A paper describes a structure:
Analysis of its nucleotide loading state using HPLC revealed that it was partially loaded with ADP (approx. 30%, data not shown). It was crystallized using PEG3350 as precipitant in the presence of KH2PO4 and crystals diffracted up to 1.4 Å using synchrotron radiation. 172 amino acid residues, 249 water molecules, one phosphate, one magnesium and two sodium ions were included in the model. No electron density was found for residues D38-K43 which are part of a disordered loop. aaTHEP1 consists of a single compact domain confirming the gel filtration experiments as well as the resistance of aaTHEP1 to limited proteolysis. All nine strands form a single sheet in topological order 918723465 wherein a five-stranded parallel and a four-stranded antiparallel region can be distinguished. In contrast, as it is the case for both aaTHEP1 and the RecA superfamily, the ASCE-proteins contain an additional strand between and a catalytic essential glutamate (E107 in aaTHEP1) within the Walker B motif, thus indicating that aaTHEP1 neither belongs to the group of GTPases nor to the kinase family. No electron density for an ADP molecule was found indicating that only the nucleotide-free protein crystallized. However, we found electron density for a phosphate ion in the putative nucleotide binding site where the β-phosphate of the nucleotide is expected. In the nucleotide free aaTHEP1, there is also a magnesium ion at the corresponding position which is octahedrally coordinated to the hydroxyl group of T14 of the P-loop, a phosphate oxygen and four water molecules. To detect putative binding sites of aaTHEP1, we colour coded the surface of aaTHEP1 with respect to the conservation of exposed amino acids. As can be seen in Figure 5, there is only one highly conserved region located in and around a cleft of the protein surface which includes the Walker A motif (P-loop).
Numbering used by the authors: 1 to 37, 44 to 178
Write the structure that this text describes.
């Protein structure tokens, strides 16, 4: 089961992912991305590891507007937790890989792109992932059109009801 959550910036995709993680408990393995307050973005894993990987203070060749992205800081936390999530999820179908966000800042990492492609196209694992509403990178387009996936456009009008639909589709 692949749940792909999309929607406008600020609509609450991370917030929803966090609710999903709490409900899933030990089933959920991966990471989400929280705003630093806005001056940047922090990766937070399901093990509570945290690091600012994109910031208005960071000098970088990898830029999204005024945010400098440190690919190495992102990878330090993202890659090992996703490699673990993928190993565990292949053996235990109760596990759900968590990836917030497959977005422009994260996609500067080749290691992340390759691992995301491997995970998303593997029929044998469950995933909850977010993508931006615009096709800001070819991998975002690829994931938006992923065959068999559940694609949810998160809005202010379904924000407070959509959780149970998602949780039912995943095993109770
Ligand atoms: Mg978010
Ligand atoms: Na959003
Ligand atoms: Na949010």
């Amino acid at each position: 089961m692949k749940i792909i959550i999309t929607g406008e910036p600020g609509v609450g995709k991370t917030t929803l992912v966090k609710k999903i993680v709490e409900r899933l408990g030990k089933r959920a393995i991966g990471f989400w991305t929280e705003e630093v307050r806005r001056t940047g973005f922090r990766i937070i894993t399901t093990e509570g590891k945290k690091k600012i990987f994109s910031s208005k203070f960071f000098t970088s060749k990898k830029l999204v507007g005024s945010y400098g992205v440190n690919v190495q800081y992102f990878e330090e936390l993202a890659i090992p937790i996703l490699e673990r999530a993928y190993r565990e999820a292949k053996k235990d179908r109760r596990k759900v890989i968590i990836i917030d966000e497959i977005g422009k800042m994260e996609l500067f990492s080749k290691k992340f792109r390759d691992l995301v492609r491997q995970i998303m196209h593997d029929p044998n694992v469950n995933v909850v992932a977010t993508i931006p509403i615009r096709d800001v990178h070819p991998l975002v387009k690829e994931i938006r059109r992923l065959p068999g996936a559940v694609l949810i456009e998160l809005t202010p009008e379904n924000r407070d009801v959509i959780l149970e639909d998602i949780l039912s589709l995943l095993e109770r």
